[PDB]
Scaffold this motif. Sequence first.
Motif, PDB file in Angstrom:
ATOM      1  N   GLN A 433       0.655  -1.202   0.214  1.00 30.95           N
ATOM      2  CA  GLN A 433       0.012  -0.056  -0.126  1.00 30.95           C
ATOM      3  C   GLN A 433       0.867   1.146   0.148  1.00 30.95           C
ATOM      4  N   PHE A 434       2.159   1.180   0.610  1.00 28.05           N
ATOM      5  CA  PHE A 434       2.770   2.290   0.803  1.00 28.05           C
ATOM      6  C   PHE A 434       3.765   2.605  -0.146  1.00 28.05           C
ATOM      7  N   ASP A 436       3.292   3.382  -3.182  1.00 27.78           N
ATOM      8  CA  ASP A 436       3.126   4.553  -4.065  1.00 27.78           C
ATOM      9  C   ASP A 436       1.896   5.204  -3.659  1.00 27.78           C
ATOM     10  N   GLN A 437       1.818   6.724  -4.167  1.00 28.71           N
ATOM     11  CA  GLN A 437       0.532   7.441  -3.591  1.00 28.71           C
ATOM     12  C   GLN A 437      -0.458   7.596  -4.417  1.00 28.71           C
ATOM     13  N   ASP A 439      -1.883   5.340  -6.382  1.00 32.45           N
ATOM     14  CA  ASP A 439      -2.675   3.994  -6.580  1.00 32.45           C
ATOM     15  C   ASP A 439      -3.855   4.079  -5.581  1.00 32.45           C
ATOM     16  N   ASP A 441      -5.382   1.766  -2.667  1.00 33.95           N
ATOM     17  CA  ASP A 441      -5.055   0.998  -1.482  1.00 33.95           C
ATOM     18  C   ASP A 441      -6.260   0.025  -1.083  1.00 33.95           C
TER      19      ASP A 441
HETATM   20 CA   LIG Z   1      -0.650   3.701  -1.988  1.00 33.12          CA
END
Ligand SMILES: [Ca+2]
Length: 593
Positions: A433-434, A436-437, A439, A441
Amino acid sequence: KHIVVCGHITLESVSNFLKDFLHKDRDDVNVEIVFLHNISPNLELEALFKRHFTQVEFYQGSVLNPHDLARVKIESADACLILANKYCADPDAEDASNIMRVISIKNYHPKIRIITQMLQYHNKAHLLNIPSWNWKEGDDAICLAELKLGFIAQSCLAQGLSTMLANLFSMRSFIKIEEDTWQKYYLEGVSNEMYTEYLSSAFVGLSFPTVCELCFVKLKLLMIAIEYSRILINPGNHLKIQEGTLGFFIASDAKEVKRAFFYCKDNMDSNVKKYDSTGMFHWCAPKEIEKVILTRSEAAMTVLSGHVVVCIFGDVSSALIGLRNLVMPLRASNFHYHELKHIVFVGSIEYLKREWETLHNFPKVSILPGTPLSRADLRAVNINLCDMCVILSANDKECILASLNIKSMQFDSITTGVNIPIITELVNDTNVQFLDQDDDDDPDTELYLTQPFACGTAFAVSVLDSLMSATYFNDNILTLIRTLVTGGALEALIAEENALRGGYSTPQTLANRDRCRVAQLALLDGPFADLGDGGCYGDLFCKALKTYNMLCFGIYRLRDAPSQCTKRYVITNPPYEFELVPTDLIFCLMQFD
Ligand SMILES: [Ca+2]
């Protein structure tokens, strides 16, 4: 008819295994999957498995006690599968215990088929001391380190490769996405799996390339390799198909694969050791660690580009990753010397010191003692100019952090570090999840569907679990993956000495340089520019192996094809009439020169 699955049995691995096996098992009505582990039942969280599935049985015993082997009926099991504790802190001790399992199991009944995982390549070798262990008759060891880092090494030559491979043997159900989003074409690629089938008599005597074309055009099959014995990935014209040749295929359904079987109608330069004895890998005399250690200032003084930066987290107490598995493939003799990517490790020198024993025979490797978190170290090693940045931890928050810290870095006219090639190896799926921003999640949306994975930006070991069942159903898929991923295979000599030994280049060793290699290709400058604008992938494919003996097997597309984001995703084996775009990159195997 049944298989025993023992070893590291966890609700997490059980439910993952059962998912894999039952997607691939064509006739799952017969088979009993019989689990065996010492830990007490968990009768509550477990009889829900006896519930969701009717072909499962749990037992209390352990594979070491011969009575349990009896009450589990090993003598009549199709195979027994050993699962390793992938994350065990002392891999050598974990590996030893599974070897012990093998021994006990073979002692009971020396003809059972055993599939097992090994953590470390050096431990794999010991199975060869077991008299009843037979690679030839189908006992297999899936080596986690060699394949983890092999996948990753290949991805340095062609980003996304790791996840393309992973989806060819992970077995899932198509989502039937109807919107015209990137996810749509991605999930199309996913549906492809890897099969193996003998070639029709009608082919015998033809060249690999002509036959490959026929499969592509007439049959809609991607044929990537051939065997009579050792596997030949994408060989050239001079290579004719004889009788009983086994073909390796990528395709979306087993039915279509069958068609392939049923077809009708100067003095001193010779004195330098540049290669291991088999002429299979670049080699060099053992450089002492000092010759290779850099200071931040030194590294700064040199400009680097097209290189591989390998960030490593760990210290003296960390278990060795076994880094030779990463650098060896990148030192395959089928690359030209000038062409080799320099490898720079950034991490604790106390840790790296340890790995060095097995690395001192590879050219163009250097170490900057530092931290993947230091921006100065990352600037010194010219991170923004690199070909790939591999982020690894030894036995996730550190890695993710390193990854995030690079993306939020500024360069030089000023450029942002969001667009540099990163691959981070994760221990936990859930926290991709962490990475990339931009995307979307969701904490139980399976790993393979997340943007980072589709983009070949994340890799987990968990992916190699589904390889367990894949190799149960088809031994050969494993040996192909292995052959492709590790460069070539020689397995005999490394088994003895645990070190590549250098040799003088005889013409027969220099023959082994002539293999294909993984590569990525641009449609801007190439002799294929024209096909860039709305051309056919099939037309490309055809000209490619016709003119160059160069097999193509996928696209790497910008997810956004108005945007600055240069993230790309994998499209495995598109159909003939798939429409090209000029900003595309193409997964291919190229011939040596
Ligand atoms: Ca993300």
